[PDB]
Design an enzyme around this catalytic site. Structure first.
Site, short mmCIF file in Angstrom:
data_model
loop_
_atom_site.label_atom_id
_atom_site.label_comp_id
_atom_site.label_asym_id
_atom_site.label_seq_id
_atom_site.Cartn_x
_atom_site.Cartn_y
_atom_site.Cartn_z
CB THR A 126 -0.94 0.02 1.21
OG1 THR A 126 -1.76 -1.16 1.23
CG2 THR A 126 -1.87 1.23 1.15
CE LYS A 149 -0.28 2.03 4.22
NZ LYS A 149 -1.74 1.96 4.50
CE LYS A 209 -4.59 -2.54 -1.32
NZ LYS A 209 -5.03 -1.43 -0.53
CG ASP A 247 -4.42 3.20 2.60
OD1 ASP A 247 -4.93 2.11 2.93
OD2 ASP A 247 -3.50 3.74 3.25
CD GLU A 248 -7.95 1.28 3.88
OE1 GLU A 248 -7.13 0.35 3.67
OE2 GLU A 248 -7.70 2.26 4.61
CG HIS A 260 -9.41 -2.93 1.38
ND1 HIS A 260 -10.12 -2.65 2.52
CD2 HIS A 260 -8.10 -2.76 1.69
CE1 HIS A 260 -9.28 -2.29 3.48
NE2 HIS A 260 -8.05 -2.37 3.01
#
Ligand code: CAP
Ligand code: CAP
Ligand code: MG
Ligand code: MG
Ligand code: MG
Lengths: 441, 440, 133, 154
Positions: free
Chosen positions: D22, D24, D50, D52-53, D143
Site C-alpha cells: 500500500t 503511504k 495499491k 489505500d482503501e 478490500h
C-alpha cells in the site's frame, strides 16, 4: 393580519446594521450611487430585490419566514454597502444562479443611478459544491514538463482572414521558434475563410511537428467557441480525436451554462480549457457601474477554467496594477485575505479546488517582461501576438526573441545580457523600444 | 510590402470614402477617445474587432487585409460607423458576432468609454438564424386570446416559498384572471424549492385553474440552471407534465445555452419566455456598454418567444422613445432607421417570427393606460407585487388587473370600470400615490 | 532528514489535546476498549490509521504536510475519544468514502479490544454536497 | 473472472507468493508524488502496488490524475524490469455508476486490474463491478474495509 398592504420603504425590513454575518452567508460588497433616495434606502432596495422583496408588501410573505431568507444590509461604509445572503437562497454548483440573484435586476433600478459589484464572499459550504479546474497549474506543468518559468504563447495574427493552411504555417514557425503554445483569436470560430475542421486539423499537425522537431511539449488552443453548446462540444471532441490536450473557450460570450458543460466534457477527456474573457470590458471596466473582474475570476475558477486572461497592466488594454494582483491571488491561492489595496473586500476560501493559470496578453513585447514578471511571477502565461509575428524577420524569429527574453529575466539576467547572445532579441528590443502604454497602479 | 513596427490604426482602417454594402454588418459606436483623436480611436475599434493588432505582422501579406478588414466609413460627432464584411462572421451565431464586435475593444486604453448603440445585421446573415418557434400570432392561436394584451405576474416573495405554497398562489392568481404566472428569474432549484416539486405542483395548479375557467392558462417554469444539460433536463420534465411553456434567463445562462434550449423547445412545441436578468449591468449607462436594442435583435434572431422590454413608468429604468424602438425590433418585419427611437439603421428580419414584448416591474392598475399607449395589444403586462399585493389576496389582485386591462383595452377608463369592480377600486385606492420617475 | 525511520508510538503525532476543532472538520466520538496500550495510545492509533498513518514511519511523509491532513485526538473523556478529520480527507457526496476511512480498518486493530463509533459531526460544507431525500 | 491460475498466466509468475504494498501515507499525497512512489516500489521488486482503501477522489488527489500518473509509473517500471507490473487503482466510489466510470477509465489507460471496497460500497455494487471487469478482462482486488465492525467479536 400581520399583512399590512401597500408600499413601505425597503429599509424597514432589509436594513439590519446589527446583523452578524455567518460563515455560511454569501456576502456582497456593492458600490452604490443613490438616485432620489437615501444611501440606506438604496442599499436596502438592492438587498430586497436580489433576495425576497418587491416594490409593495405581499400577503404571501406570511407563507414563509422572511426574516430567515431575506438578504441583510449589515454595514454601510461610505458608498460601499455590505449585504449578506443566507446560503439557502442559492442553487448548489451554479454561478448562473448566483448571477440571477445578485446581478439579475438590481442594476436597472431607478432608485440607483449606478451600481457596481466590487467583491463577493462565496461561503465555503457553497464552494465545495463546485468542481473547479480539471488540470490547473501544477498538473499542466507535469503534463508538459515545464518548471520554474512562465509559459509563453501568442495569438495568431491577423485576427481574421487567414486560410487554414496559412494558419498552420504560422503556428509551426512560432512553436518551433520557442513559444510553448499558440492560439486561435477569440473571434476565430468557423467562417468562410477558415472552417473549423480545416483549421483544427492543420493546426494540430503543425503542433505535433514542432514538438517532435524541438523535443518539447507544444500545443495550440483550438477555439471551440460556437453559437450552441452542442456545437461547441462537437468541436471539443474533434480536438480530442486529433490528439489535442487543450482548447480555448470564450466563456462570457458563450455563457457560464455552456462553459459548465464544456469544462465537464474537457475534464472527462483530459484536456485543458483556456478561458478567454471576451466581452468582459462591457461591464468590468467602468469603476462606478458593473461587475468587478475579480468577481468574474472567482466564478470562473469555481466553474472550472484552467486558464484565465487577467490583463497586462502595461499593454494596450486597461488594467490597474494592484487590482491585477488581487485577481492573480484569487486564481492561484487556496485562501485569500481581505486587502482593499488589492480590491479584496472579503477573505475567500477556495476549499482545495485546483488553481487556474493567470494569463497576461495584449500589446506586450520584450521590454515589458521585467514588469510582467514582477506582477505575475512564474505561474502565468505571457502571450505575444503582434509581439511575435511583428518581428522584422517573421514568426519563428519573434518566438526566439520572446522565449530568450522570458528565460533570461526569469533566471535573473537582463534583456541587455540576453541580447548579447541573441540577435533575434536585439531586433525586437530595437523595434519596440519607444512603444509604451499608460501604467496605472 | 511588409514594414515592421507600430503604425497608426487610421492608416488602414479609417476609410471615409467607403461605400457600405448590403452584405456588410454595420455598427454604430459611441466613442470617448483617450489620448488619441476620435478618428484614431474609431480606427482602433475597427481594427481590433476585425483583422488588426498593435503592430504590423508579416502574416498580413498572407491574406487580403483590404477585403476582410473593418472600415470606419463615417463619423458624426461621437458616433463612429463601422462596416464589417460578411465573411468575418460565422453563420447563425450571436456568440461569434459578440466575439468580434464587443470582444476586446471595450477595454482599450485608447478609449475612455465605448457604447455599441445599434448594429445592422445584413439580411444574408439574418437568414441563417431560425428566429422564434412560436412568436406572437401562434401563441394567440394556441391560447385563443385576441385583440388585447396578455396579463401575467411573478410569484412573490422572490425566494423562500415552499413548492406547495407556490402552487396555491399560482392557482389563486390564474383563477382570478391572469393569463400566465411565472417563477422569479432567480428561482432555479434551491433548498426551499427543489425544481421537480415546484414544477409538478405548479402545473397541477395551471390545469386546475384552466379547467375551472374554461380558459387557457400557463405558468413559465424556470429551466435556468448551472449547465445547458441540466436546463435541458428541466425543460424535458416541464414538457412531460404537459406544460406548453417555460422561462429562461438567456443572458445569465448565455447565448450558447439559449440556442440549445430554444431548439429543443421548438421540437417539443413549447414557448420559451426570455428573462433578461443581468442586462442592466451593461445596457444602463449611455457612456458605456451595449444598448438593449442590440440585445433585442440578438434574442429574436436566436429564437426567444418573449422578451422583457421595460415599463418606462415602473420601478426599473427605461426611456419611452428607446422602448418604442426596442418594441418595433421585436415585432416588425422591417424596422426603419429613426434616431428619435435610437435606431441608427434599417433592420430587415427576413420573415422570422416576432417576439412578444414583456412589460414588467413595479407597475399597477394606474399604469395601464400608459402601458397600452406604449405597447398596444401585442405584449405581456406582468403584475407581481401588483397582484399579490392586493389587500384581499392574489385572486382579488388578478381580478382587478384583468378588469383594468380589459377596460382600457376596450375604451373605458379605470374609474368607469372601477364602479362595477370593487377589487379594482381597492387596487386604485391602495396605489394611487405610487409613482416612479418617467423619462421620455 | 526529517525522516526518522522505525516505529514510534501513534500518540507522538496523533494525540493533540490542544487542537481546536474547526467548523469544517468531520468530528468523531469513539468508545474505546484499549488492549495492551494506553487509552491515549489506543485513541491515537484509531486517529492515525483512519487518516494518514501506518505502523512505522515512512519517508514519503515528507512529500506532504502531515500536520495538515492528519486526524487529531483533541479530547478524551473517559473511554470516549473525540477525533477531528480535516475536510480535505473526504470525497464529496460519498458516505462510502466516509465509511472507508472512519470504519474501514480501525475496528480490527489488535491494540483495541473493542471499538464503537457513537456519533459523527459531518461538517456543513460536506453536507451541502449531498442531495438528501 | 480471473482467479489464481490465470493471474499467474497473465503475469507469468509461478511457484511463489506475489508481493505488493500500500502507498503511504494513507491520504494527503499529490497524484504526482503517488506516481513517484509507485515507480520506486514496483521497480525495486514489488509485483503490485495499491491505493489505500480510503483513497477515492479527494481535493488532494482527484481520481483521474492519480489513475493516469499511476499507470504511467506501472508501465515505465514494467518496461525497465522486463517484468509484469500492476497497481490496484481504487474505483470505490459513492455510487455504482461512478465506480463503473472509474473502472472504464482504468481499462482505457491499459490497466489490467483495479481495487474495490466491496463491503463499504456493498454487495450489490460489487456484483456490477465484477461483471464489467470480467467483460473488460480485468482483475478486481477486493478490500474488506469495515469487516471488523461485525467480524471481530466472537
Ligand atoms: O485580440 C487580441 O488583441 C489578443 O489576441 C492580443 O493580441 P496581440 O498579442 O497581438 O496583442 C488577445 O485576445 C487580447 O489580449 C485579449 O485581452 P485580455 O487579455 O485583456 O483579455
Ligand atoms: O424580479 C422582479 O422584480 C420582477 O419579477 C418584477 O416583479 P414585480 O412585478 O413584483 O415588480 C421582474 O423579474 C422584473 O420586472 C424584471 O425586470 P425587467 O422586466 O425590467 O427586465
Ligand atoms: Mg484575441
Ligand atoms: Mg423577477
Ligand atoms: Mg489500506
Amino acid at each position: 393580519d400581520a399583512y399590512k398592504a401597500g408600499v413601505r420603504a425597503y429599509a424597514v425590513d432589509y436594513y439590519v446594521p446589527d446583523y452578524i454575518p455567518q460563515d455560511t452567508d454569501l456576502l456582497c460588497a456593492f458600490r452604490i450611487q443613490p438616485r432620489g433616495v437615501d444611501m440606506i434606502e438604496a442599499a436596502a432596495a438592492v438587498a430586497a430585490e436580489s433576495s425576497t422583496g418587491t416594490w409593495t408588501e405581499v400577503w404571501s410573505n406570511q407563507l414563509t419566514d422572511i426574516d430567515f431568507y431575506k438578504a441583510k444590509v449589515y454595514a454601510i461604509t461610505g458608498d460601499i454597502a455590505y449585504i449578506a445572503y443566507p446560503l439557502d437562497l442559492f442553487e448548489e454548483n451554479s454561478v448562473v444562479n448566483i448571477m440571477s440573484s445578485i446581478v439579475g435586476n438590481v442594476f436597472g433600478f431607478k432608485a440607483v443611478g449606478a451600481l457596481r459589484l466590487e467583491d463577493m464572499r462565496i461561503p465555503l459550504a457553497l464552494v465545495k459544491t463546485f468542481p473547479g479546474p480539471r488540470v490547473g497549474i501544477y498538473d499542466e506543468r507535469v503534463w508538459s514538463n515545464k518548471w520554474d518559468r512562465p509559459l509563453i504563447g501568442g495569438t495568431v495574427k491577423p485576427k481574421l482572414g487567414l486560410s487554414p493552411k496559412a494558419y498552420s504555417t504560422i503556428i509551426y514557425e512560432c512553436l518551433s521558434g520557442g513559444l510553448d503554445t499558440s492560439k486561435d483569436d477569440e473571434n476565430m470560430n468557423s467562417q468562410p475563410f477558415s472552417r473549423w475542421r480545416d483549421r483544427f486539423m492543420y493546426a494540430q499537425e503543425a503542433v505535433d511537428r514542432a514538438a517532435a522537431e524541438t523535443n518539447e511539449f507544444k500545443g495550440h488552443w483550438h477555439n471551440v467557441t460556437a453559437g450552441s453548446t452542442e456545437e461547441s462540444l462537437r468541436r471539443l471532441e474533434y480536438a480530442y480525436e486529433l490528439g489535442s490536450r487543450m482548447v480555448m473557450f470564450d466563456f462570457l460570450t458563450a455563457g457560464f451554462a455552456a462553459s459548465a458543460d464544456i469544462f465537464k466534457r474537457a475534464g472527462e477527456l483530459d484536456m485543458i480549457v483556456h478561458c478567454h474573457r471576451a466581452m468582459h470590458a462591457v461591464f468590468t471596466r467602468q469603476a462606478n457601474h458593473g461587475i468587478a473582474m475579480r468577481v468574474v475570476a472567482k466564478w470562473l475558477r469555481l466553474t472550472g477554467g484552467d486558464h484565465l486572461h487577467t490583463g497586462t497592466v502595461v499593454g494596450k488594454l486597461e488594467g490597474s496594477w494592484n487590482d491585477t494582483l488581487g485577481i492573480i491571488d484569487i486564481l492561484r491561492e487556496r485562501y485569500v485575505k481581505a486587502n482593499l489595496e488589492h480590491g479584496l473586500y472579503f477573505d475567500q476560501d477556495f476549499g482545495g479546488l485546483k488553481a487556474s493559470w493567470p494569463v497576461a496578453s495584449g500589446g506586450i513585447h520584450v521590454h515589458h517582461v521585467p514588469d510582467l514578471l514582477k506582477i505575475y511571477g512564474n505561474d502565468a502565461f505571457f502571450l505575444f501576438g503582434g509581439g511575435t509575428h511583428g518581428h522584422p524577420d517573421g514568426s519563428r524569429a519573434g518566438a526566439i526573441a520572446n522565449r530568450a527574453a522570458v528565460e533570461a529575466v526569469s533566471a535573473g539576467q537582463t534583456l541587455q545580457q540576453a541580447a548579447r547572445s541573441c540577435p533575434e532579441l536585439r531586433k525586437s528590443l530595437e523595434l519596440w523600444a519607444d512603444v509604451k502604454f499608460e501604467v496605472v497602479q
